Amino acid sequence: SRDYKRKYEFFRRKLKKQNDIPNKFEMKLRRATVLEDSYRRIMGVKRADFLKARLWIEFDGEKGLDYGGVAREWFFLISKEMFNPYYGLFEYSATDNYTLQINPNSGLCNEDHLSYFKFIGRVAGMAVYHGKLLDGFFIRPFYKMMLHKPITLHDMESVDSEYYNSLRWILENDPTELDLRFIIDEELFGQTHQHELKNGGSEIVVTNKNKKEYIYLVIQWRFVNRIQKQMAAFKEGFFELIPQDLIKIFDENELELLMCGLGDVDVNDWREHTKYKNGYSANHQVIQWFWKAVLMMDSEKRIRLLQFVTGTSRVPMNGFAELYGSNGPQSFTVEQWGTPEKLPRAHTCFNRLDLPPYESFEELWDKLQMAIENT
């Protein structure tokens, strides 16, 4: 089979251009109401295929800009809004994670919530159709639901590890003597909430004979049952732009990468194909601290550092041994430039981090992550 790169190019060949469509899609929005205005237009088009036209976007009556860049800005701005937990469509999967899942209480904000999921679906499809990325990472089960792949216990590990270990225990041992029932206790607002996994579930005991069912119903309750209509509205919109036949070529990792640009970076591969100049070296103290800092950063923040130094996020194929700059090949490198008072600067055309010789690890962390806060 093909690898991701060939897969993508194959996918692009199959995604045929739209003939029977106006040569552009005009929408004029206002930054302060970018959600309401984007929604109204994109959900108002005669046909979804109008969205496949080249994107002619205009913010606030500001006339005369490069539409390839204004659109990229829109994808960034509309993502920020759609995926803000304030609105109640999406919420963080856990207190300790940066990943997003559908909020099952979405309907309480807005009775009309489902049509907003279709909108988000269309915009996601538009990102994929025109080759731009959404700004936001979803939980793995979001990506599997899109591909109609089964949600597994393995998918619980990435989200909630303590809960995954209780269910793995149950899987690997006989739970009969625990006297567990076909119910789920949930903690909300400092109260206990018990839900039937099935009819008369409180009176049915979990054993080795029915536990595979048990684990399945749990996983469903956690990731599917309360969010079926929302996801189904999101998919309808998404599939109005990308035929679901075509998306099945990718698996859940490749799909995340396609839509959003993961998100899973081997820091060892990063470290062993790096150069050092202007006094720095493989074992210099400042460089040790740099590699410590990177190690402890969020996989989201590691990428935002890579975006800053490279140009955009997209680790090359075969790892960091084949990184390219502007003119030909260019390995990731660090140069001892400037003085501790100034932040680090990046030359994207030479994939190089100009890094001052800082005196402390925490100073390095302070200055490095300030200079990343821009993209």
Ligand X SMILES: */C(=C\C(=O)OC)CNC(=O)c1c(C)n(C)c2ccc(OC)cc12
Q: Give me the residues that bind ligand X (CB under 6 A), please.
A: 35, 87-89, 103, 105-106, 108-110, 113, 116
By DSSP bridging, strand 275-277 and strand 333-335 are parallel
Contacts of 143 (CB under 8 A, 6+ apart): 252, 255, 256
Query: Which residues are paired to 29 by β-bridges?
Result: 59
CB of 127 to ligand X, least distance (A): 20
Per-residue HEC secondary structure of 35-50 comes to HHHHHHHHCCCCCHHH
Q: How far apart are CA 156 and CA 43, in angstroms?
A: 34
Which uninterrupted H or E stretch holds 161?
helix 161-172
Look up residue 86 and give its two tokens: 């304030």
CA dist., res. 168 & res. 153, Å (int):
8
Residues ≥6 apart with Cβ < 8 Å to 117: 89, 102, 106, 230, 231, 233, 234, 237
Amino acid at 341: E
Residues, the chain? 375
Kindly state the smallest distance separating residue 231's Cβ from ligand X, in Å.
14
Alpha carbons 234 and 117: distance in angstroms, whole number: 5
Distance from C-alpha of 282 to C-alpha of 120, rounded to nearest angstrom? 46
Q: Which residue has the tokens 């159709």?
A: 129
Between CA 338 and CA 127 the distance in angstroms is 39
**133 vs 128: CA distance, rounded Å:** 7
- The rounded Cα 331 to chain-centroid distance in angstroms is 26
State in angstroms the smallest separation of the CB of 259 from ligand X. 21
Using a 10 angstrom Cβ sphere, with 0-12 exposed, 13-18 middle and 19 or more buried, the burial of residue 194 is exposed
CB of 35 to ligand X, least distance (A): 6
What six digits make up the tokens of 68? Answer: 């390839």
**Scanning the structure block, which residue is given the tokens 């300790």?**
96
Residue nearer to ligand X on the CB measure, 105 or 312 = 105
Q: Hey, which residues are catalytic here?
A: 349
Tell me how far CA of residue 142 lies from CA of 223, 253, 365, in angstroms: 8, 11, 33
Cα separation, 336 vs 279, whole angstroms:
6
